[PDB]
Amino acid sequence: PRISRHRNSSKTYSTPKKPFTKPRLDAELKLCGEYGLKCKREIYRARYMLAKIRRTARNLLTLDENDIKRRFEGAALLRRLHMLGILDEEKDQLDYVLGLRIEDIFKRRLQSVIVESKLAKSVHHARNMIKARHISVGGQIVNIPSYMVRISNTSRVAIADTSSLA
Amino acid sequence: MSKTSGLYTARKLRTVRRVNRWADKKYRKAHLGTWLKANPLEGACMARGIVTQKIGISAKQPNSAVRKAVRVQLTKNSKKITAFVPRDGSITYIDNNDEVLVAGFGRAGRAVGDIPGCRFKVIKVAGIGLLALFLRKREKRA
Amino acid sequence: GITHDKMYKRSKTGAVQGKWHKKRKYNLGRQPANTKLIQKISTIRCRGGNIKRRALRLSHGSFAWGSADISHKARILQVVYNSTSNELVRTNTLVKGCVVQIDSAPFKSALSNDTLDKEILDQIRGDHILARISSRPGQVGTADGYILEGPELLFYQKKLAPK
Amino acid sequence: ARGVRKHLKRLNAPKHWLLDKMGGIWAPRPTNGPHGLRECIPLILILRNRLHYANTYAETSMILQDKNVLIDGKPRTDPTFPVGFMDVFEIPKVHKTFRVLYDVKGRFTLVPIQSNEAGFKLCRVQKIFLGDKGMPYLSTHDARTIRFPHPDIKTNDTIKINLKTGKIDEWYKFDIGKIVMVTGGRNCGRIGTIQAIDKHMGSYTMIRMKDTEGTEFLTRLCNVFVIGNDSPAVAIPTTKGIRPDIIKNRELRLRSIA
RNA sequence: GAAGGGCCGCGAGCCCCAGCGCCUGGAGGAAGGAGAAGUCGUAACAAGGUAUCCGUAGGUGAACCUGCGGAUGGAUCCCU
RNA sequence: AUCCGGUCGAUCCUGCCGGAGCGCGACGCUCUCCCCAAGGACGAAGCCAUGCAUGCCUCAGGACGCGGCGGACGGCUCAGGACAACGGUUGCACCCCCCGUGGCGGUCGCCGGACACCGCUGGCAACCCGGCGCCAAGACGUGCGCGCAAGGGCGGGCCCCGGGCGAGCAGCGUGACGCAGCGACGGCCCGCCCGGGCUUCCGGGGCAUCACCCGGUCGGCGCGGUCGCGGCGCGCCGAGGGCCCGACGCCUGGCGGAGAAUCAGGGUUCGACUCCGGAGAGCGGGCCUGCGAGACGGCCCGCACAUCCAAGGACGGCAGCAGGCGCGGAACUUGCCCAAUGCGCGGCGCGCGGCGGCGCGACGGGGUGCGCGCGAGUCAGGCGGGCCCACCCCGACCCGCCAGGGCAAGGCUGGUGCCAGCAGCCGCGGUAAUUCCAGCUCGGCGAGCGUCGCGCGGCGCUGCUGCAGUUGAAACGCCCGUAGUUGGCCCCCCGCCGCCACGAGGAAACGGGAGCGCUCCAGGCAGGUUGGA
């Protein structure tokens, strides 16, 4: 067989069960307003990634406090959530992995980082400037709007010094 | 308990299930094969044939209308069916020997609405989709 | 060809069993030697090499008298008994286990030393001795053996009685 | 099939060969000889994939043509040559002499040694038998044979061999209390002391060892190679056959980047 | 030692007979279903104008009628 | 871990019908940029024009030929086959094996003629061959040699229990046969190895409108054949063997597993194709050569089909790669390269395998603006690449598809007047239509939307978890009764099952899962003392 038959691939979003439901059909465009979202697949994707960390946490929390699998994956899960900035330092217990939301995932996009840093007038301006290739992340130039910035790479957001803007 | 129990009754709990599944009309309809036989399409999404006559069908008891249909002779097994031509005015695009493509109404071969005896419909005539043909996106030659 | 595959036999409940391949070479059978008494030894090439000697028309063999511990060579004279069938006796066909008469001339110097089995000595005074074939003529191209004694001798003499 | 197998798909290759699932549809298939097909690692996969002496098959071949690879004191020219446990690996142009041992995850490591060390070979006595005209032979785990063996040498013990003259100088006895290293199983690469040899009629005999920090383990007697007598006769890697557990390993993988 | 021949072992192909499916023609005959607004009566629902209904047997254009035993789901929870 | 609409004058139920989600294909409409990627499997295992798919190196400039090694591996497909095969788990004290590794090597004076390539003459329509002749061996043949191939007779203990074992197994000795193999460039032979054959146990489709079934069938003795055991075969003797814990028979649009789809838990359904195992090469059969084949890119015959031909004859097997026909709702080029990966032989060969082409099956990422700068294209140079190109880098120019009465988010003018038409289900339409046909306006998801068929879910409408049986569908008219299922209380601290835990031993890939910024990402196993736990 050609060697390409052996590559893995996978879907990254889940579509809600009841589509035509007014109350959250409204709070769903509210999110497309408070950030610059092309369509609903980027809310679906955020729900998809929150669901998995929730499922892992419930699996671990069924278990017992002195157990090895807790001692392994709880520490791993908290470390990766803290370094992505989905969870902050003061909450170092697994039971806090349950009370997150989509919004704290959205907070660490570049479009949010540069608006905290005030590098763009707004979020829609931030989007257009992202694709114009004008903002770099620590000396390397990042074309991605959905880019997820570790709080280590979060001090080094700025204009890309090769740009019409220095 | 009106059901058998006890650690050594697995064989009976399986015999009961196997016998009682056939009392469900859907399980029997999808697993007995007599429908797979009686099905004019022989278990497919669609099939083609040649038109043998154009007919009109008088609607069922509450409504009143003359729906439009064609008697189709299937190519793959030489059977007779009737297909409802949808979408106002389309019955003109179905000549007396045409290769037409036939699919279903839904409901796995049950009559729909008020059209008696018809479980199929035509979706393409002479290589052209009838939706676009109605919508003036393609045109039959002459 | 001839085969000894089991797939053509029934199960242990009597049911016809199905057929899921074509004859394999490694289950072949061959026809048998049917070694006639009284000098050919064919060669057969078996699986992986392995010369097999296949006899036709043997005349002599090496025969051992055990209790006296004397061996001589001798000319098979006649096949007289066989446990399977009278047909292999009537045709003088050399197979393992058959009982034959051998020439007495080689063993006539044992007629001197006394305190020996008189049932062997008086038979040496004649002109043959009764013996059994111990080898497989169709597999190794040879027919050697031992002279009978014990209850077994008496058993075969009674089978040979003038009834 | 209708005969022997020549080819070998990459996925069907042994897991401990550490091949990568991309980079081909085929794998090198080891050739018959001094070791098997499962408990070995070929010469090409050592040179080309480990040490980068060659970046390709087409130039590993020529390294083996002008005879640059001494295995067990004798050269080799076959890329698919199976080198295994305790074999000596000396290339002179780069001044490197090794012996093959197992790591503590069941993989093949090349330990550096000295010219006072590459003069002998440890073999496991697989069996004692009789050949032509009634003579005794000992056949071992490296497919060496020794005739007229000293009667004290019995099955499952270990011998020490000279690579040049091919004769036995020392032997070690498999008893209760011998320093020994495993070669298969899920404790492959671990070293301990024989402290139980439990026998069973008809079936396999089981062996129970312990490291020098108290951790104990079990295996079949087919997987217990003897290395010394309360002291190893050959060198062993700076981990010495003690396995960490998953969390200790994880902190080390954290440290190496920290 | 070749061609060629004799007997058996393996085993095509065809013939011939029986089994075993599955599909299909057919004068007649007899059901079921839908379009129906066609005749003839009025069996049921009220004590439906002879309370209704079960089993069985017979009889009549049709629904149905009648005999023998049963039931209330009856039109009666009620009397030396 | 969720419901909704459809049986009334109104009302509570049962119960189905219809709607709402994911996936697989097919059809319709539409299409800016990049990355990944499946693709004549679907009761046609139907038929094939054309080309290619297997070669590489002892004896003389070289070819040619001889000799040798390989062509039994690799590729394709799923027709047959349901106590098979297959999966785990045993065994061979019933076996066979090339290459390679390590051993071992004792065997009762340089020989002989002849074959192909080639020379001279030929037959034939073409297919293919004849006759004569001069020439080699790491080719045969014979063989120089210190006796040892197969098989066979005797050499065991008459409570029972190291050469090697759990196990009387393997050697040796000694009486007879025989003369095999190795020797004209020293190898017969032996351990290991990978591979095979068979073999123990447990798992291993539907139908009872298939209840009895089998007769080398079940066992015993003896020979034969086999690499070998065995009713495997043959002779003789006996009457066994399987079965409601489902035999036997029939059917399958039956390849098995690793796995995949769905989604609280328990479950349902599918296992064409990536790895492993099996089986076949149009359909029955037979066989030669070889360590290894019942081989079809080997041969021989019967059948069904086709091909050239001067009419006498010869000849084929795409379920190999491309391509054609036919079938069907349904599936791409009659490309270039052996540079990597591997295998063969040895520097080459390889339609393995790779690299481009077709490719809205499907996956992942980014736009159609923001308040004033970009990508999409064009032209140049790198980088990469067997040769081009795509990605990256530097220079100069520069939506659409469905709907708007309810289920279910979204409401005025004209036309038509139970017509035409809509409508999955309720229902709409009778000359004032919230539903048809249109215009305006608004809703939905969005480079993708809609229609059709099927699987899972919805469904506690298949119920082990967990349904119902007075009247809605449903307790056999009753009593006895075998198989089956179930069975009070008691002694603890023994043995044998069940059960619970923890191990050992065997495959990756997939599924999870630790670490790692392909700019992110679907990914991959990277990478800056390392690592792939």
Added chain:
RNA sequence: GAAAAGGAGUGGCUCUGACGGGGUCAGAACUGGAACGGACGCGGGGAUCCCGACUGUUUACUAGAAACACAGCGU
């Protein structure tokens, strides 16, 4: 129904086994124009319709049947 329908073997000679002197039954090798119940003796078969249930009786000398009788049934 039924010997349904349909198939195969069968001579001579040389032997072998089973039954408690006596033949029968079973098996094998060889052999003959490709023959064998070698003369003799000795059913052709099947699908249906009408009548009478059946075995039996009758027009000696042109009619053997569907006619008579019959068991059973009834008066």
